[PDB]
Design a protein around this ligand. Sequence first.
Ligand SMILES: CCCN1CCN(C(=O)c2cc(Cn3c(=O)[nH]c(=O)c4ccccc43)ccc2F)CC1=O
Length: 351
Amino acid sequence: HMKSKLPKPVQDLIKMIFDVESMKKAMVEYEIDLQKMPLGKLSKRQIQAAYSILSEVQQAVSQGSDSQILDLSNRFYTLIPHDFGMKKPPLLNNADSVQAKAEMLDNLLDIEVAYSLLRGGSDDSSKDPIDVNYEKLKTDIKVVDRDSEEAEIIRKYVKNTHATTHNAYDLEVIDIFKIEREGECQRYKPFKQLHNRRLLWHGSRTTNFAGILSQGLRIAPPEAPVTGYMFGKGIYFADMVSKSANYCHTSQGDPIGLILLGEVALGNMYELKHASHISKLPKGKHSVKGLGKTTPDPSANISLDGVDVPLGTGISSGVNDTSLLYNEYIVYDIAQVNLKYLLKLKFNFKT
Ligand SMILES: CCCN1CCN(C(=O)c2cc(Cn3c(=O)[nH]c(=O)c4ccccc43)ccc2F)CC1=O
């Protein structure tokens, strides 16, 4: 084939995110039986139906029996086959079970998008599959120059906001990409001048990124159990890089991760200390801020293309009896996010 003119960093990004074996590896990490639910038999209606049963399990837990729970639990495993041999699988009888399974289904949604791009489309041997898969993302991806100002600011954001409690690893930035999802700037127009626009982190596993770049960061569907998400069903960001980087789920056996920086239109924040599984914001609010005990030093906020970058070292916020060690930001309308960068990260595990 004609060999692809894309920058090498862009080619390795495309290799990573469309890797079929990585998708499978993620699935067996969630204890899915690939013999019964292979990557190709995954579909949206199966994932949604599973979400609903998980909403049934949520209902039965909120009103307290291991007798009547058993039936709902089994119905879940019926829709998403798990790898337990001749079994009796573990009972899904608590809030932790619901959170953990909702998170798995979130990932399956993104994996199904990635695989549907791969199996949709055309076959032409004379094109480099790298170029072919790139086009499927409908996302302009450029390499940001190491010596630019934007690169310096980004590396400082990474350098300054790694929490002491996440010190089992550190981060080097391998590549910085500037990204522009088709139509996202247009979608963002209503919020582009809103106050309190902040450049924030969103980490995810590499097997979700094809989904993210083609479909954007998204709201979990109606069927998903609201109780599975600490501040309900929205799009979550952090101001501490390590808090987001934990969601990459890197390890000693695959240490390269991907993390986003999005411009988030937060406006009037509904400030919370503890879990609130809301399905709408109070009138007049545009976002939830989950209040951390620690925050980037607000005096070291810097501006990048008119957007605040909270890149100060972590200090005490002053908030007292909070569930959150660090800040968290949630929006509930997809149009409040404009994705700006994508970093490839090297994780040095010190353990
Ligand atoms: C439903 C499609 C896939 N999906 C999964 C849900 N989602 C989220 O942003 C989300 C993400 C998380 C977990 N999470 C996360 O995965 N990455 C983060 O950087 C993060 C930062 C602060 C708090 C949570 C974070 C929890 C609940 C969520 F709703 C956006 C999203 O598009």
